[PDB]
Ligand binder design. Structure first.
Ligand SMILES: CC(C)(COP(=O)(O)OP(=O)(O)OC[C@H]1O[C@@H](n2cnc3c(N)ncnc32)[C@H](O)[C@@H]1OP(=O)(O)O)[C@@H](O)C(=O)NCCC(=O)NCCS
Ligand SMILES: CC(C)(COP(=O)(O)OP(=O)(O)OC[C@H]1O[C@@H](n2cnc3c(N)ncnc32)[C@H](O)[C@@H]1OP(=O)(O)O)[C@@H](O)C(=O)NCCC(=O)NCCS
Lengths: 260, 259
């Protein structure tokens, strides 16, 4: 029953381990933060204060389509193509990625289901050259987050929502990786075109692992004492080094596959 | 039954939008039912019908809650109203945010009377919005009448026709409740608290119920100069701005003469 301020939130974020200049991909359950004087926008502004204008805040936008094509052909000519400036974020990811995407100055990646919204000094870099096929691999904001030794913050969100770990699935050498194939409308030369996509499946867990297996891995990684826990506002949170948990999750997966 | 950009276009043409129209829209998006490309299809269908020269509006207002007055000793943690950054009030539903967050959209200065606009004259409608008395003649509402614009209640309840607050402003009747409040805005790009004054829009004139706007709109429809119809699955009405205000002003002025 405490209220948070732009000012109060900056202190929590510094305590959790966020500092000057780094890139943080944020997953959030905003109601967990409790009351905020200026709403959730106070959070983004708190963050940007802490990391400074060279830091970058990321969100997982995804897109809103709903497999409508598969749900209904002959609904095909009525589906607006994916437009990184105009396609609104998937609602399942909560308000946060839409908060960012609609904040002035923000930018948004090209690969439609894997699309990220970013804001700050390197927003351009992170949203540039997002590959259309295998958009969870090396040529994506996720792969870039690893190269820049960025961070992931679970802002009250459930721990099996850490999208970064899909990058690990892509990288890890294990047997029988499911492949997803689907066709979706996008823009080519200013016009709407339908295009066939190819990627590892991220919508389903592989080989009988539970749907929430991402959570156990984050949990395990935190036990090693190289993550950090803390409260932001009223929300229990987790801040984690991007490159250290990817490499960690790749070994978890690589062993599980062998072990079978 | 599903709606599309094409489908919504024909419903919008059926109700009476045309090339060049200005339209202030109030909406209850949920009863439009299922739309293929989301509610953005409504805005996209509207713009098709009215064209690049037509303009669509939404009532943005802002998220303050008298927090200022809810608890000073938070006074200072209250960000100023920024027409480019302040989200619209959630009581007005998604529609105004939808417009506001569409690229090319614009917003005016008067925080509580703040309007979102998009299209050919969006610059004109949002410009020079008076801080004091933001529902008078130098507001987007006043310009709507000057432009012979329209109001579309998209499934919305009828007493949410903000345009009629403009009539309250214009109409001469006794004992209008004047309202004074203090609010943080940007002066010189810096937060500065400022005392406002408006006629009250939060409570009716002493007398009428809080929803009397609904009575008036229904009586204007009885005259036969409105038009009723279905946009998607939402029961809707479309009225001329100029005519509804004129109507409402007389209704108001007549009632005050019962002195
Ligand atoms: C599903 C999930 C999003 C649920 O979130 P939630 O806690 O219900 O809340 P949300 O983040 O959607 O945000 C809700 C709060 O946003 C705030 N909010 C929403 N819109 C707002 C607005 N326009 N203006 C101001 N505040 C707003 C409100 O406080 C809202 O609460 P309310 O519903 O009481 O108003 C959360 O459980 C979760 O899974 N988060 C992580 C999801 C994710 O990142 N997924 C990645 C892929 S798996
Ligand atoms: C209050 C009021 C808005 C509630 O109506 P509502 O049916 O909840 O309508 P909303 O406009 O909030 O839209 C809800 C629909 O949003 C769509 N929506 C909201 N955000 C969306 C988004 N980001 N992307 C896609 N769809 C979204 C969904 O259909 C959503 O409902 P869901 O929860 O079923 O998904 C309505 O009764 C009303 O009075 N509207 C007029 C308000 C007004 O103009 N007031 C003027 C001043 S008095």
């Amino acid at each position: 029953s405490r209220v948070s301020t732009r000012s109060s939130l900056a202190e929590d974020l510094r305590a959790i381990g966020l500092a000057d200049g780094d890139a943080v991909l944020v997953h959030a359950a905003l109601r967990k933060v409790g009351k905020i004087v200026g709403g959730p926008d106070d959070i983004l502004d708190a963050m940007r204060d802490v990391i400074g204008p060279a830091g970058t805040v990321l969100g997982y936008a995804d897109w809103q389509l709903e497999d409508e094509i598969r749900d209904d052909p002959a609904m095909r000519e009525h589906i607006p193509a994916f437009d990184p400036l105009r396609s609104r974020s998937i609602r399942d990811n909560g308000f946060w990625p839409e908060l960012i995407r609609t904040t002035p100055g923000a930018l948004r990646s090209a690969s439609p289901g894997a699309s990220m919204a970013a804001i700050g000094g390197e927003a351009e870099w992170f949203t540039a050259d997002h590959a259309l096929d295998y958009g969870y691999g090396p040529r994506s904001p996720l792969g870039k987050l690893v190269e820049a030794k960025g961070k992931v913050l679970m802002l009250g969100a459930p721990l099996d929502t850490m999208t970064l770990l899909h990058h690990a699935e892509h990288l890890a050498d294990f047997p029988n990786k499911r492949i997803l194939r689907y066709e979706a409308p996008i823009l080519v030369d200013g016009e709407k075109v339908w295009r066939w996509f190819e990627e590892f499946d991220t919508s389903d867990p592989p080989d009988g692992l539970a749907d929430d297996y991402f959570a156990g891995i984050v949990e395990e990684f935190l036990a090693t004492g190289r993550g950090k826990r803390g409260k932001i506002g009223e929300a229990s949170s987790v801040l984690v080094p991007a490159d250290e948990i990817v490499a960690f999750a790749v070994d978890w997966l690589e062993r599980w596959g062998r072990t079978a």
